Amino acid sequence: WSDALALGWPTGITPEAKLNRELWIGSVIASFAVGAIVWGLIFWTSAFHRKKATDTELPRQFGYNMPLELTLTVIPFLIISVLFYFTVVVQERMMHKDPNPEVVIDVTAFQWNWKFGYQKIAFADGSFDYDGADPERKEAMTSRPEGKDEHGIEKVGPIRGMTPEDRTYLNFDKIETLGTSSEIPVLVLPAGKRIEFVLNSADVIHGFWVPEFLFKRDVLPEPKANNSDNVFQVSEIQQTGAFVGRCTEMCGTFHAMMNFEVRVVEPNDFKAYIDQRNAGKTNAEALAAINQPPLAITTEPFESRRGELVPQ
Amino acid sequence: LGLMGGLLTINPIWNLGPYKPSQVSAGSQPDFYMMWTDGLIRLWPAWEFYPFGHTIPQGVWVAVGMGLVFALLIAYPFIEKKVTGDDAHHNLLQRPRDVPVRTAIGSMAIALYLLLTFACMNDIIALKFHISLNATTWIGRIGMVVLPAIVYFVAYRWAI
Amino acid sequence: WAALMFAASIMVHLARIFFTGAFRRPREANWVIGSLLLILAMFEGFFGYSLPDD
Amino acid sequence: QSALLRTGKQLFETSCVSCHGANLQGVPDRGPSLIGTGEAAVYFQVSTGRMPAMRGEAQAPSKPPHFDESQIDALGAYVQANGGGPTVPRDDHGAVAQESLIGGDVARGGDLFRLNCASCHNFTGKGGALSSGKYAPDLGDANPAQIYTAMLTGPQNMPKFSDRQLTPDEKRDIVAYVRESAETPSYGGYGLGGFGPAPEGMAMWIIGMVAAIGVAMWIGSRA
Amino acid sequence: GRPGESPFVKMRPEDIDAGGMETVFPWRESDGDGTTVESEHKLTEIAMGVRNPVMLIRIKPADMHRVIKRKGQESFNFGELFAYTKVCSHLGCPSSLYEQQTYRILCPCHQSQFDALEFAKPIFGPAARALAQLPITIDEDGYLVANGDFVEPVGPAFWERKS
Amino acid sequence: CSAGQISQTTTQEPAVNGVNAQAGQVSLRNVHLRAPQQTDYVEPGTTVELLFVAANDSTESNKLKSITSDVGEVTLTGDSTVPADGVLIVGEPDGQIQAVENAEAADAVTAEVELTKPITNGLLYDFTFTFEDGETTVAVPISAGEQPRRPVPPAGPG
Amino acid sequence: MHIEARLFEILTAFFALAAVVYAVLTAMFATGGVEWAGTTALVLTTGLTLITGTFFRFVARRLDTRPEDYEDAEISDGAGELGFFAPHSWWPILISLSFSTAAVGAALWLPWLIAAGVAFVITSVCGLVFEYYWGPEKH
Amino acid sequence: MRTELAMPGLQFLSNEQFNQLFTMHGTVMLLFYATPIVFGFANLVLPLQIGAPDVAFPRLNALSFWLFLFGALIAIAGFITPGGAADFGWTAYSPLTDAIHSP
Amino acid sequence: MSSTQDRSQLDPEVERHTGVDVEDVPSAEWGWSHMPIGVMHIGGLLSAAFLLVMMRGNHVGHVEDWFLIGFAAVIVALVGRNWWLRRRGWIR
Numbered sequence A: 001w002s003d004a005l006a007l008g009w010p011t012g013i014t015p016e017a018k019l020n021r022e023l024w025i026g027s028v029i030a031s032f033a034v035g036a037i038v039w040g041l042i043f044w045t046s047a048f049h050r051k052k053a054t055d056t057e058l059p060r061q062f063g064y065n066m067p068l069e070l071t072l073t074v075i076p077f078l079i080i081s082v083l084f085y086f087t088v089v090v091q092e093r094m095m096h097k098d099p100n101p102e103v104v105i106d107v108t109a110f111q112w113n114w115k116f117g118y119q120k121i122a123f124a125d126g127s128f129d130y131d132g133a134d135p136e137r138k139e140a141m142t143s144r145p146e147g148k149d150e151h152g153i154e155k156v157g158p159i160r161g162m163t164p165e166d167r168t169y170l171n172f173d174k175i176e177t178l179g180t181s182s183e184i185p186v187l188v189l190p191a192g193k194r195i196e197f198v199l200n201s202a203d204v205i206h207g208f209w210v211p212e213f214l215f216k217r218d219v220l221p222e223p224k225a226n227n228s229d230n231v232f233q234v235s236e237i238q239q240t241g242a243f244v245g246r247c248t249e250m251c252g253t254f255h256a257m258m259n260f261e262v263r264v265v266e267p268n269d270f271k272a273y274i275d276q277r278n279a280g281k282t283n284a285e286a287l288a289a290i291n292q293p294p295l296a297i298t299t300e301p302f303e304s305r306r307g308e309l310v311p312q
Numbered sequence B: 001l002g003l004m005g006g007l008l009t010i011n012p013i014w015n016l017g018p019y020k021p022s023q024v025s026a027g028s029q030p031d032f033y034m035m036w037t038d039g040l041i042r043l044w045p046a047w048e049f050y051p052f053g054h055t056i057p058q059g060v061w062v063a064v065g066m067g068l069v070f071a072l073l074i075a076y077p078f079i080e081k082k083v084t085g086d087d088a089h090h091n092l093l094q095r096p097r098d099v100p101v102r103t104a105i106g107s108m109a110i111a112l113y114l115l116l117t118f119a120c121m122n123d124i125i126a127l128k129f130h131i132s133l134n135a136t137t138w139i140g141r142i143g144m145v146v147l148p149a150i151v152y153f154v155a156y157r158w159a160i
Numbered sequence C: 001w002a003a004l005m006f007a008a009s010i011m012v013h014l015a016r017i018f019f020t021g022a023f024r025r026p027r028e029a030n031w032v033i034g035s036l037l038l039i040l041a042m043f044e045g046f047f048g049y050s051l052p053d054d
Numbered sequence D: 001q002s003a004l005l006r007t008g009k010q011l012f013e014t015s016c017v018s019c020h021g022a023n024l025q026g027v028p029d030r031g032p033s034l035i036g037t038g039e040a041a042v043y044f045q046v047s048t049g050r051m052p053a054m055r056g057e058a059q060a061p062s063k064p065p066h067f068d069e070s071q072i073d074a075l076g077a078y079v080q081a082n083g084g085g086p087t088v089p090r091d092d093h094g095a096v097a098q099e100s101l102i103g104g105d106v107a108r109g110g111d112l113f114r115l116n117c118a119s120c121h122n123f124t125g126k127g128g129a130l131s132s133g134k135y136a137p138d139l140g141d142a143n144p145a146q147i148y149t150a151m152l153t154g155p156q157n158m159p160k161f162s163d164r165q166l167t168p169d170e171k172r173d174i175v176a177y178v179r180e181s182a183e184t185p186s187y188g189g190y191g192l193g194g195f196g197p198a199p200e201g202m203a204m205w206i207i208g209m210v211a212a213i214g215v216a217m218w219i220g221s222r223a
Numbered sequence E: 001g002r003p004g005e006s007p008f009v010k011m012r013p014e015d016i017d018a019g020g021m022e023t024v025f026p027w028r029e030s031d032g033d034g035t036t037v038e039s040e041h042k043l044t045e046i047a048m049g050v051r052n053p054v055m056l057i058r059i060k061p062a063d064m065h066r067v068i069k070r071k072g073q074e075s076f077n078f079g080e081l082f083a084y085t086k087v088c089s090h091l092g093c094p095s096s097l098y099e100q101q102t103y104r105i106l107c108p109c110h111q112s113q114f115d116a117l118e119f120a121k122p123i124f125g126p127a128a129r130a131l132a133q134l135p136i137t138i139d140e141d142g143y144l145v146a147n148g149d150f151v152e153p154v155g156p157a158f159w160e161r162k163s
Numbered sequence F: 001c002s003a004g005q006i007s008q009t010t011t012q013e014p015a016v017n018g019v020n021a022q023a024g025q026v027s028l029r030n031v032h033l034r035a036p037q038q039t040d041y042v043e044p045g046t047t048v049e050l051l052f053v054a055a056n057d058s059t060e061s062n063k064l065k066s067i068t069s070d071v072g073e074v075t076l077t078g079d080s081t082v083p084a085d086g087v088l089i090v091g092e093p094d095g096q097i098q099a100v101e102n103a104e105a106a107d108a109v110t111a112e113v114e115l116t117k118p119i120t121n122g123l124l125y126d127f128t129f130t131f132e133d134g135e136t137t138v139a140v141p142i143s144a145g146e147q148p149r150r151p152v153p154p155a156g157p158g
Numbered sequence G: 001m002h003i004e005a006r007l008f009e010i011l012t013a014f015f016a017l018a019a020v021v022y023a024v025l026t027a028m029f030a031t032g033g034v035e036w037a038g039t040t041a042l043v044l045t046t047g048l049t050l051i052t053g054t055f056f057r058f059v060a061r062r063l064d065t066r067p068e069d070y071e072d073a074e075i076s077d078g079a080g081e082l083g084f085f086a087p088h089s090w091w092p093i094l095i096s097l098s099f100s101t102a103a104v105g106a107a108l109w110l111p112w113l114i115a116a117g118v119a120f121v122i123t124s125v126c127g128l129v130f131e132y133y134w135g136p137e138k139h
Numbered sequence H: 001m002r003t004e005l006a007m008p009g010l011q012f013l014s015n016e017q018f019n020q021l022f023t024m025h026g027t028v029m030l031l032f033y034a035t036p037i038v039f040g041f042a043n044l045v046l047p048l049q050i051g052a053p054d055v056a057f058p059r060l061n062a063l064s065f066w067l068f069l070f071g072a073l074i075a076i077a078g079f080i081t082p083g084g085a086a087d088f089g090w091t092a093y094s095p096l097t098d099a100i101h102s103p
Numbered sequence I: 001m002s003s004t005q006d007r008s009q010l011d012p013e014v015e016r017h018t019g020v021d022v023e024d025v026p027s028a029e030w031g032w033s034h035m036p037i038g039v040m041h042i043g044g045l046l047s048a049a050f051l052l053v054m055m056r057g058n059h060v061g062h063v064e065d066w067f068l069i070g071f072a073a074v075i076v077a078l079v080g081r082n083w084w085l086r087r088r089g090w091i092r
């Protein structure tokens, strides 16, 4: 009954998703109760037809029932206040911001595909002395001594001394699981661990959704400069396997082609995968080595052809 | 005229290099008074006839079109008198609203002329106002039979 | 520019006379010669801006 | 250069692998392969900004560049290393040459422009229309390196002018003519755009004819 | 574009590259450079010839398989080189505009497109006759030379045509 | 609606002299012949180089590049099994940068052909590139990579 | 105009409260301090309603109770000379067309079509404003 | 948009043609059907409902309609252009709208 | 008040007793006011025929032909509606 009444909510795979789904079930229960009573009122007053027995006498013509107005304007306030309290306590576990993440994934989301960096891994049980790449971050400070003019301008840069095309906010890593248009990216994560996602976008605002996480976040170009908390954590992921992930914003033409996968494997499988990726190997090769299908099983790559009726 | 000769540049022949058959630009338009003939050339749909061992190019179509335009323009008063029946010595003008059919016909003709004039400019219209060149050509082709009718109806009702 | 204004003003004058009916019974020959004049002006400008081989 | 290649690769991987697939091979029906396009093609296209392209249409429009000169050079070096092809000109220091591309002869440049360029662009480098939604853009924004590289690599529906077809001296002359025609003030007043008949007729009908009609309405009496 | 001296220079297939268009003219060895007075009149005649200018197009080898060929013009092309008259088949303006990756020869005068891939048949605009195709080849030394003459009159059509 | 399923921009080949042959798992890009010709033909018995880039499409590899020979006896000096989700660059197209002082496996799989048949620029000559996956005829062109104009003799009026 | 002014006074009170609370709760408890966009928008919509309400209150104090504001007001009380309401006019469509020609000139960056649309707009606004003041033609 | 979404494939629409459709569908329905028709109903009966003979500025409300009509048309005019209408959704978020994106 | 009424005697010469009437066109006597409906019907039919005939041409395109078909169809529909209504006496 829970699945049917959840209105197509995928049963969460992380405690945050489970709790959010429970809140959704409660909210839908309350909303359906309110809807049932109001629809009952409507279909009941629809029984107050203009009966032919009604002689030349109009109805009571009352209007203006102050006590009833007060009752029906105080009860909704209490209902929404309870909903708001539950919403606040649930939202509290939206990003606990644990200062000790077990694996940090640098989620760059560029124009019409994804890239996952594996910025840092530090298992609480004790393992994975791994880190990201501090180099490769090259600024674009246009601090030339002189511009077109002869002297005096000594222009530093448009914004904070930097040109708009800077990409210093973008952080890079040694292990990059870039997604090609013909090879859907598969971010592999260890099951049972705390996984932090540091979200960034290369070109345009867009979204990052894992329907099984019951949570999405907008990958912004420069979240820190935009006053956005791009980074967000997931306490755990119990269920293993591959879970589709969509882009949940507007990106451009190929916005529906940004589907990726999150493949939750066992911690030992993640050990083997990261070791074999540190060794020169692609994501598909590492998946095959750890004996898991290399290509995204939940979603095939979209046909790069612009449509069915195009003549190939 | 002097102010415009000063302040506005007309026909910069120095920019327009000397004529050479191998060279050409993209504009290639005549002055606005011949722009309607050029637009007729552009819009007319490439209908050529090939009699026994001969060719009848699309140029004849536009030539006959110009001939018809001039013949009708020259012979309108006699056409109008034959149609309506009025040969009375008229010295008092009549407001264009007071003659719905003639003002409607004149509006239709002006609409056709404007359509042809802008068809001749479809190249620059397409370039600046971002509309595909084929779209502009076919807009002209369809309009030169649709727009005159629309303008005729609208002008007739407007006069009434 | 005078050529362009000449053509434009001939066109506007033609519009005026046609719409006000300044051609019927009398002045019909005047309209005829005016039409010839407009055609001549058109081709005159055509030969004019074609005169400097460009 | 090693770091230049690495920077070009990093920019490529997060900019265009969705439509110029990784390995520089083209994504079928999204973008052509960049093997053999060369550094000149990358410089022209990205600097004009056409390449961070967010639609498949009749023509890729120009736009503000998404990369600064250093990143343009990085991407160009990456593409040149992967494919190998034409290279953008450079001056003695190493920066992309701008003034060095101004050919000495301008009459020769204009003749070549009219024979080859004006065909579609204009008498003086204003824009021109093409078959189905395409158009030759105005050249007044392009800088000498951009013009030279545009000739060197036919960007889109534009003939590719090799160095053999147009020796770099001829291309320099054409660049000189383009810049001169673009930066030259209109003698005789405001050149209404660069197209004679159409802007001139509109200006007649709007400026001269409204003036004449308004003056006639002032002088005469409505009735 | 050299002002006056050696205005026309022999040409080689390698000079053009795939997706390239070059305007060429009928130059004879006797019509040497413009230094002499005898020359510079033959050369002026070549330049001013209404039906003289031709456009040589290098069809991209990838798209060479989309080429359709006219009756009697099947061997006219030299490999991937196609020489079509520039003079538009309708009213004779040059068709100088060329769109590569579309292979459309557009005429600026009245916006007529000819499909260069196929024989240059008009696929839009007023033109109704395909552009005449010049037979081309390479002589000794590899220089491009016309392998004959147009099998049809090349300018715009007229009454005495198609026979 | 120039943006529909059939749009000009998307369906455009690269503005490069080399042809593209997508047939087979491995895709051939910018495949051309460096055959500098001093006359009408490149006479038989002269070695000309065969440039191209073989890009692997699938990660599951087709790195064999068995023969890729046709009329001309194309030989692959320094042959290697490069393509694994990557590029095999057989030669150095004009303008190619080595990208590092050293090199891997000496020459990077340079393909050279002893013609045994005249060829000239502007013609298309069929080459059968055969990987273990399959074989494809490519119809390679002749490309003058970056060589400028060869000075034609001045003309003596007659 | 007491109720007309009091409506805007209530809106001003609410919008001032919203602006103040937003500014405080964004200066503290926000990721990057004051938002500076919502804060300014709320402050200046408070200003919008404040200007309107202040003018309405000034007018309410300046004017005696109108029949419209007066309950138990007979129709005859307000019966009289209503002012000039513009009859038929074709200047609004011309103003709209001129502003559309300026707008397309701005969209398609055509300085010449912007310049002309603005001229067009000036001409049509002049026509609309002078419509009922152009004295008889003096010959 | 609905016919295209009936089947998983891209039967007859391209990605950007579809993107133009919900952009213009969203804006046309809101800004050219919903917001201009409240003033359509207001102009219809509001003077009647308060007992007034006409609106305060009856030449102005005439201008409002024509500004709506012509303003609406030039937004629809994106379709006739070869590129098409606005790709970005009705919301028209910032980075996707700048000259770099959706040019 | 500063306006004088106008007296006009224009020379008249069809006598307007058949065709259009002042109730339909107030200035019927002052100028040409009636175009025979057959003229407009035949003009619309020929315009539709011309639009359809323009489909035959040297264009590989197909949206052009479809636009021609649509415009010709609406023209023919308008002409047919007008003719049918006038046949029945302007009913439905």
Ligand SMILES: CCCCCCCCCCCCCCCC(=O)O[C@H](COC(=O)CCCCCCC[C@@H](C)CCCCCCCCC)COP(=O)(O)O[C@H]1[C@H](O)[C@H](O)[C@H](O)[C@@H](O)[C@@H]1O
Residues within 6 Å of the ligand: B007, B008, D125, D126, D138, D139, D140, D141, D181, D182, D183, D185, D186, D189, D190, D191, D192, D193, D202, D203, D206, D207, G111, G112, G113, G115, G116, G117
């Ligand atoms: C009433 C009588 C008065 C007549 C007007 C007289 C104005 C005199 C102006 C002053 C003297 C002449 C200046 C000549 C210097 C000069 O030429 O002026 C250009 C400007 O040009 C523009 O943009 C236009 C700017 C907008 C202002 C002018 C608009 C006036 C129009 C509206 C008049 C005609 C009426 C048409 C009515 C339209 C509505 C129809 C319904 C400025 O340079 P630029 O901007 O950079 O030009 C680019 C090269 O650089 C670059 O290479 C090249 O490639 C190009 O891009 C070129 O534009």
Ligand SMILES: CCCCCCCCCCCCCCCC(=O)O[C@H](COC(=O)CCCCCCC[C@@H](C)CCCCCCCCC)COP(=O)(O)O[C@H]1[C@H](O)[C@H](O)[C@H](O)[C@@H](O)[C@@H]1O
Residues within 6 Å of the ligand: B114, B115, B118, B132, B134, B135, B136, B138, B139, B140, B142, B143, B144, B146, B147, D058, D131, D132, D133, F001, F002, F003, F004, F006, F007, F008, H079, H080, H081, H082, I061, I062, I063, I064, I065, I067
């Ligand atoms: C004087 C103007 C008034 C004219 C009045 C007459 C009104 C009737 C207009 C008739 C419109 C005819 C439109 C069709 C025309 C047609 O057949 O062409 C098409 C392009 O469709 C379109 O956009 C249709 C756009 C239609 C919008 C018409 C807008 C009317 C405007 C002009 C009215 C405002 C007038 C302003 C008056 C100013 C007053 C001045 C005082 C396809 O070209 P293409 O681009 O090559 O498409 C290829 C694919 O097909 C192929 O799959 C794919 O592979 C690609 O190759 C693709 O390119």
Ligand SMILES: CCCCCCCC/C=C\CCCCCCCC(=O)OC[C@H](COP(=O)(O)OCCN)OC(=O)CCCCCCCCCCCCCCC
Residues within 6 Å of the ligand: A309, A310, A311, F001, F004, F005, F006, H012, H013, H014, H017, I060, I061, I062, I063, I064, I066, I067, I069, I070, I071, I074
């Ligand atoms: C209310 C109607 C609503 C109708 C709305 C439909 C909108 C969908 C249109 C385009 C979508 C993008 C596809 C873009 C590609 C086109 C699809 C295709 O390939 O369809 C097959 C062939 C061409 O084959 P081709 O390969 O293109 O090559 C060809 C030469 N080489 O056309 C056909 O038979 C089928 C016809 C295809 C489109 C024709 C639509 C034009 C106008 C319809 C009516 C206008 C009415 C005006 C009224 C006054």
Ligand code: HEC
Residues within 6 Å of the ligand: A111, D012, D015, D016, D019, D020, D030, D031, D032, D034, D037, D041, D042, D043, D045, D046, D050, D051, D052, D053, D054, D055, D056, D059, D060, D075, D153, D154, D155, D156, F009, F010, F012, F013, F014, F015, F016
């Ligand atoms: C579909 C979106 C798109 C993206 C994003 C894009 N390209 Fe392209 N690219 C194309 C298309 C389509 C063409 C051919 C048509 C054109 O250029 O207009 C092309 C062609 C090119 C060319 C010229 C090819 C030639 O033969 O002249 C270069 C160089 C290039 N791309 C490099 C890049 C670089 C570098 C980037 C990232 C900075 C990039 N592109 C991003 C689609 C794209």
Ligand code: HEM
Residues within 6 Å of the ligand: B011, C003, C004, C006, C041, C044, C045, C047, C048, C049, C050, C051, C052
């Ligand atoms: C009768 C109406 C006339 C019209 C419509 C007309 C039109 C024109 C036009 C548009 C030009 C092009 C000018 C240019 O491009 O700079 C021109 C050139 C010329 N006109 Fe006329 N003209 C007319 C009468 C005359 C007359 C009466 C003469 C001699 C008295 C004359 C002599 C010339 C000359 C010599 C030129 C060449 C100028 C040049 O090449 O720049 N025209 N004419």
Ligand SMILES: CCCCCCCCCCCCCCCC(=O)OC[C@H](C)OC(=O)CCCCCCCC[C@@H](C)CCCCCCCC
Residues within 6 Å of the ligand: F001, F002, H073, H076, H077, H079, H080, I063, I066, I071, I074, I075
């Ligand atoms: C008979 C005359 C009256 C019309 C009769 C009923 C007219 C009924 C017209 C059905 C039209 C059906 C079209 C089917 C599309 C098709 O299958 O081809 C796809 C093609 C490839 O896609 C396009 O290229 C663009 C398609 C979009 C058209 C944008 C037009 C926007 C108009 C604006 C510019 C405003 C103009 C002002 C117009 C002002 C008028 C307002 C109503």
Ligand SMILES: *C(=O)CCCCCCCCCCCCCCC
Residues within 6 Å of the ligand: F001, F002, F003, H017, H020, H021, H079, H080, H081, H082, H083, H084, H085
């Ligand atoms: C490319 O140039 C345009 C692509 C747009 C294709 C989809 C068009 C949707 C229909 C728009 C309706 C226009 C108004 C109809 C008037 C009757």
Ligand code: FES
Residues within 6 Å of the ligand: E088, E089, E090, E091, E092, E093, E094, E107, E108, E109, E110, E111, E112, E125, E126, E127
């Ligand atoms: S002159 Fe070439 S199409 Fe008319």
Ligand SMILES: [Cu+2]
Residues within 6 Å of the ligand: A206, A207, A246, A247, A248, A249, A250, A251, A255, A256, A258
């Ligand atoms: Cu997305």
Ligand SMILES: [Cu+2]
Residues within 6 Å of the ligand: A109, A110, A111, A112, A113, A204, A205, A206, A207, A250, A251
């Ligand atoms: Cu995105």
